[PDB]
Each structure stands twice: as structure tokens, then as C-alpha cells.
Design a protein around this motif. Structure first.
Motif, PDB file in Angstrom:
ATOM      1  N   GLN A 105       0.828  -1.199   0.000  1.00 17.55           N
ATOM      2  CA  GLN A 105       0.000   0.000   0.000  1.00 17.55           C
ATOM      3  C   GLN A 105       0.865   1.253   0.000  1.00 17.55           C
ATOM      4  OE1 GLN A 105      -2.960   0.032   3.064  1.00 17.55           O
ATOM      5  NE2 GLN A 105      -3.636   2.131   2.638  1.00 17.55           N
ATOM      6  N   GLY A 106       0.483   2.225  -0.824  1.00 17.32           N
ATOM      7  CA  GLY A 106       1.250   3.440  -0.995  1.00 17.32           C
ATOM      8  C   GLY A 106       2.145   3.470  -2.213  1.00 17.32           C
ATOM      9  N   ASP A 107       2.339   2.339  -2.885  1.00 13.56           N
ATOM     10  CA  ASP A 107       3.149   2.313  -4.095  1.00 13.56           C
ATOM     11  C   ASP A 107       2.394   2.936  -5.263  1.00 13.56           C
ATOM     12  OD1 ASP A 107       5.126   0.995  -2.650  1.00 13.56           O
ATOM     13  OD2 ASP A 107       4.415  -0.995  -3.248  1.00 13.56           O
ATOM     14  N   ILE A 108       3.150   3.430  -6.240  1.00 11.59           N
ATOM     15  CA  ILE A 108       2.599   4.024  -7.452  1.00 11.59           C
ATOM     16  C   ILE A 108       3.061   3.196  -8.644  1.00 11.59           C
ATOM     17  CG2 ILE A 108       2.408   6.090  -8.862  1.00 11.59           C
ATOM     18  CD1 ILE A 108       3.019   7.754  -6.431  1.00 11.59           C
ATOM     19  N   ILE A 109       2.102   2.692  -9.422  1.00 12.06           N
ATOM     20  CA  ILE A 109       2.405   1.935 -10.632  1.00 12.06           C
ATOM     21  C   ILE A 109       2.348   2.868 -11.834  1.00 12.06           C
ATOM     22  CG2 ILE A 109       1.692  -0.010 -12.071  1.00 12.06           C
ATOM     23  CD1 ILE A 109       2.882  -0.879  -9.489  1.00 12.06           C
ATOM     24  N   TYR A 110       3.251   2.658 -12.783  1.00  8.30           N
ATOM     25  CA  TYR A 110       3.253   3.381 -14.045  1.00  8.30           C
ATOM     26  C   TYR A 110       3.282   2.386 -15.198  1.00  8.30           C
ATOM     27  CZ  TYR A 110       4.616   7.377 -11.131  1.00  8.30           C
ATOM     28  OH  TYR A 110       4.669   8.355 -10.165  1.00  8.30           O
ATOM     29  N   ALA A 111       2.557   2.701 -16.271  1.00  9.50           N
ATOM     30  CA  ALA A 111       2.492   1.830 -17.433  1.00  9.50           C
ATOM     31  C   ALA A 111       2.514   2.657 -18.709  1.00  9.50           C
ATOM     32  CB  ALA A 111       1.237   0.950 -17.406  1.00  9.50           C
ATOM     33  N   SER A 112       3.109   2.089 -19.755  1.00  9.94           N
ATOM     34  CA  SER A 112       3.124   2.704 -21.074  1.00  9.94           C
ATOM     35  C   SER A 112       3.240   1.609 -22.123  1.00  9.94           C
ATOM     36  CB  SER A 112       4.277   3.701 -21.218  1.00  9.94           C
ATOM     37  OG  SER A 112       5.531   3.046 -21.157  1.00  9.94           O
ATOM     38  N   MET A 113       2.438   1.717 -23.180  1.00  5.87           N
ATOM     39  CA  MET A 113       2.384   0.699 -24.220  1.00  5.87           C
ATOM     40  C   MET A 113       2.400   1.379 -25.581  1.00  5.87           C
ATOM     41  SD  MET A 113      -0.342  -2.433 -24.524  1.00  5.87           S
ATOM     42  CE  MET A 113      -0.313  -3.627 -25.856  1.00  5.87           C
ATOM     43  N   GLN A 114       3.349   0.995 -26.429  1.00  5.55           N
ATOM     44  CA  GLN A 114       3.537   1.619 -27.731  1.00  5.55           C
ATOM     45  C   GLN A 114       3.480   0.575 -28.836  1.00  5.55           C
ATOM     46  OE1 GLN A 114       7.171   3.880 -27.746  1.00  5.55           O
ATOM     47  NE2 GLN A 114       6.337   5.512 -26.450  1.00  5.55           N
ATOM     48  N   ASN A 115       2.966   0.987 -29.992  1.00  2.00           N
ATOM     49  CA  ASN A 115       2.880   0.109 -31.147  1.00  2.00           C
ATOM     50  C   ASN A 115       4.217   0.068 -31.879  1.00  2.00           C
ATOM     51  OD1 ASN A 115       1.159  -1.268 -33.455  1.00  2.00           O
ATOM     52  ND2 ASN A 115       2.309   0.393 -34.428  1.00  2.00           N
ATOM     53  N   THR A 116       4.687  -1.142 -32.183  1.00  2.09           N
ATOM     54  CA  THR A 116       5.952  -1.335 -32.879  1.00  2.09           C
ATOM     55  C   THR A 116       5.802  -2.053 -34.214  1.00  2.09           C
ATOM     56  OG1 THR A 116       6.358  -3.374 -31.634  1.00  2.09           O
ATOM     57  CG2 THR A 116       7.249  -1.330 -30.731  1.00  2.09           C
ATOM     58  N   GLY A 117       4.578  -2.323 -34.655  1.00  2.60           N
ATOM     59  CA  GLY A 117       4.350  -2.996 -35.919  1.00  2.60           C
ATOM     60  C   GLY A 117       2.902  -3.396 -36.091  1.00  2.60           C
ATOM     61  N   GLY A 118       2.383  -3.279 -37.308  1.00  2.00           N
ATOM     62  CA  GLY A 118       0.987  -3.563 -37.553  1.00  2.00           C
ATOM     63  C   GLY A 118       0.084  -2.386 -37.234  1.00  2.00           C
ATOM     64  N   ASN A 119      -1.203  -2.698 -37.081  1.00  2.00           N
ATOM     65  CA  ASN A 119      -2.232  -1.701 -36.812  1.00  2.00           C
ATOM     66  C   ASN A 119      -2.744  -1.748 -35.376  1.00  2.00           C
ATOM     67  OD1 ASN A 119      -3.523  -4.207 -37.295  1.00  2.00           O
ATOM     68  ND2 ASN A 119      -5.444  -3.153 -37.767  1.00  2.00           N
ATOM     69  N   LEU A 120      -1.949  -2.274 -34.446  1.00  2.00           N
ATOM     70  CA  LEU A 120      -2.390  -2.441 -33.067  1.00  2.00           C
ATOM     71  C   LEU A 120      -2.712  -1.103 -32.409  1.00  2.00           C
ATOM     72  CD1 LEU A 120      -2.822  -4.172 -30.545  1.00  2.00           C
ATOM     73  CD2 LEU A 120      -0.365  -4.016 -30.122  1.00  2.00           C
ATOM     74  N   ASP A 121      -3.809  -1.078 -31.654  1.00  2.24           N
ATOM     75  CA  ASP A 121      -4.193   0.077 -30.853  1.00  2.24           C
ATOM     76  C   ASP A 121      -4.119  -0.294 -29.378  1.00  2.24           C
ATOM     77  OD1 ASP A 121      -5.184   2.539 -30.005  1.00  2.24           O
ATOM     78  OD2 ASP A 121      -6.653   2.628 -31.630  1.00  2.24           O
ATOM     79  N   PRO A 122      -3.092   0.143 -28.648  1.00  4.18           N
ATOM     80  CA  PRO A 122      -2.869  -0.366 -27.288  1.00  4.18           C
ATOM     81  C   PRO A 122      -3.981  -0.010 -26.309  1.00  4.18           C
ATOM     82  CG  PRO A 122      -0.881   0.633 -28.168  1.00  4.18           C
ATOM     83  CD  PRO A 122      -1.983   0.990 -29.108  1.00  4.18           C
ATOM     84  N   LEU A 123      -4.178  -0.900 -25.336  1.00  2.00           N
ATOM     85  CA  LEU A 123      -5.054  -0.688 -24.191  1.00  2.00           C
ATOM     86  C   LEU A 123      -4.451  -1.390 -22.980  1.00  2.00           C
ATOM     87  CD1 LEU A 123      -7.667   0.173 -22.743  1.00  2.00           C
ATOM     88  CD2 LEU A 123      -8.751  -1.885 -23.652  1.00  2.00           C
TER      89      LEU A 123
END
Lengths: 160, 125
Positions: free
Chosen positions: B24-42
Motif C-alpha cells: 500500500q502506498g506504491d505508485i504503478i506506471y504503465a506505457s504501451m507503444q505500437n511497434t508494428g501492424g495496426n495495433l491500438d494499445p489498451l
């Protein structure tokens, strides 16, 4: 004649290096945009469109919107034509909003607000509810940027 | 504390990642990027691991048959499935997420594909 284009403006306060044109930002700010103190200018346009038998789908491209701007649009049929569907997508096709049928169900309205630095929008109007060849259905489209008063504009299309 | 991962998404089949014993008290960070194709990250975060496929499929079932307003139906379903999520918070269609760890325990991170339209001649999510 006058001239058109983009520009870069550097302002300094008691910083004699600015007149050289190479002053890097420093210190604490002292000047701000004046237009932010009041309301932005509205731009209104009205168009008439017709959905033929083979042309039931139509799209229109919108100019770039600055952050904080707003977008409105409404469609009203000329006569007894059925109400078409309305939606807003970007230049890639990602949806942003969908049209809402009002309680006096004779028109559809759409609303959106700007978040990104630059937004390129496309307005979709389609009458492909089924496969009926209704014929020469014609609709009136009213659109505005920073113009929430599209319901009762009054003035002729202003701006650009 | 930074970690990298790479994967592949096929026809909206997501990948789960496990975060064992966060505090408890931790902070999570996330990031997702497309590297090929038509992917739309979620990206989404949740406590108990459950496959979102059955719930997300009903969103495609409704839009495919009507107006339904995808952007409404997707937000309502996501706010139920996940404790936190992001679609397009980054550069372009990339996602970015900040999430403060509520209590003490373990959680799951879900990476996958959102529901989007990529045509101007007709609408097809």
C-alpha cells in the motif's frame, strides 16, 4: 497588400541580448496572451446535402482545432426524409462522439471538446439504415466552432 | 524500478502480467507503444485475474447491430472490469497509466487491443 504566415516572437525585459534575436528563455514570465481574457470568435457554416441511392454515405473533413476549443453540429431534413445517423471520428477513423436525437425528434445534435494539441476531425452522415431506395432525400447541415448558439444563430455564417 | 516486455497480440487476445505482493502506498506506471501492424494499445489493472474476452465481446455485439455509441459502451464496461485503465493518454494512440496501490496484496496488469474504427467509407468496429 498584406501578408500571411507563421511567426516566432521573442520578448525580453531588461535583457539586452534579445535584440540579437538569440535570447533563450530565462527568469519568471511577465507577459501573456491578451485574447485569453475574453471569449473566442465563433465560426459558423451551413451546407445542404443530398443522399442519393448510391451515395448514402458522406464524410467531411474539418480544419485543425486548438486545445480548449469546442465543436457543435446539427442536421435538419428539408422535408419528410427520415433522420440519418451522425458521428464524429478523427482522420484515422477513431470515434469521438455520437449524435443524440432530441425530444422533439426532428433533428440530431453532436458535441465535442478538444484535449490534444491538434485535432483533425471527420463528420460522418449516413442513411444506410437498410436497403430502401427512398430517392432524393435532402438534409440541411449546420456546423460551428466555439459557437454553442447553433440552435438559434440569427447571424449569417460568420468567420471562415 | 523499471522493466521491459515485448509481445504480440492476435485478434484481440490479451496478455496478463502478474505483480506479486505490492505494498500500500506504491505508485504503478504503465506505457504501451505500437511497434508494428495496426495495433491500438489498451492497458488495465485489476486484482483478480479474469479474462475480459467474454465481457468485451458483448460490446462488439451491440455496436455491430445498431448505433449503440461505442465510446459510451466501452467506458461503462471498462469502469466495471478494471480498477484503472487508459486508452490514448500517450503520443498518438499509445496508452499511459498512473495507479496508486489501494491496499496491500497482489494485482494483475492486462495488455491488449481496444475496439476502434479505421475506415472512412463505412463504420465497422
Amino acid at each position: 497588400t498584406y501578408t500571411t504566415g507563421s511567426f516566432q516572437l521573442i520578448l525580453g525585459l531588461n535583457a539586452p541580448q534579445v535584440i540579437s534575436g538569440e535570447g533563450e528563455p530565462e527568469g519568471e514570465v511577465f507577459a501573456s496572451l491578451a485574447s485569453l481574457e475574453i471569449k473566442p470568435e465563433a465560426h459558423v457554416q451551413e451546407l445542404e446535402i443530398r443522399l442519393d441511392k448510391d451515395t448514402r454515405y458522406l464524410t467531411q473533413h474539418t480544419r485543425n482545432l486548438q486545445p480548449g476549443d469546442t465543436f457543435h453540429a446539427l442536421v435538419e431534413p428539408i422535408g419528410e426524409a427520415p433522420l440519418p445517423r451522425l458521428r464524429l471520428t478523427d482522420s484515422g477513423g477513431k470515434p469521438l462522439a455520437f449524435g443524440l436525437i432530441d425530444q422533439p425528434g426532428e433533428s440530431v445534435e453532436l458535441n465535442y471538446t478538444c484535449d490534444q494539441d491538434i485535432c483533425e476531425l471527420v463528420v460522418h452522415v449516413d442513411g444506410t439504415d437498410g436497403q430502401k431506395d427512398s430517392g432524393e432525400a435532402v438534409y440541411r447541415l449546420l456546423v460551428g466552432i466555439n459557437a454553442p448558439n447553433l440552435r438559434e444563430s440569427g447571424q449569417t455564417p460568420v468567420g471562415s | 524500478r523499471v522493466q521491459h516486455f515485448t509481445g504480440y497480440i492476435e485478434d484481440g487476445r490479451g496478455i496478463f502480467y502478474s505483480l506479486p505482493d505490492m505494498k500500500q502506498g506504491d505508485i504503478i506506471y504503465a506505457s504501451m507503444q505500437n511497434t508494428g501492424g495496426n495495433l491500438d494499445p489498451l492497458v488495465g489493472i485489476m486484482a483478480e485475474e479474469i479474462d475480459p474476452a467474454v465481457s468485451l465481446g458483448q460490446v462488439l455485439e451491440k455496436a455491430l447491430a445498431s448505433e449503440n455509441d461505442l465510446i459510451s459502451e466501452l467506458t461503462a464496461v471498462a469502469d466495471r472490469i478494471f480498477l484503472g485503465w487508459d486508452d490514448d493518454g500517450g503520443k498518438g494512440y499509445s496508452a499511459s497509466l498512473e495507479f496508486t496501490i489501494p491496499r496491500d496484496g497482489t494485482y494483475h496488469i492486462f495488455a491488449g487491443s481496444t475496439i476502434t474504427n479505421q475506415r472512412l467509407d463505412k463504420f465497422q468496429p
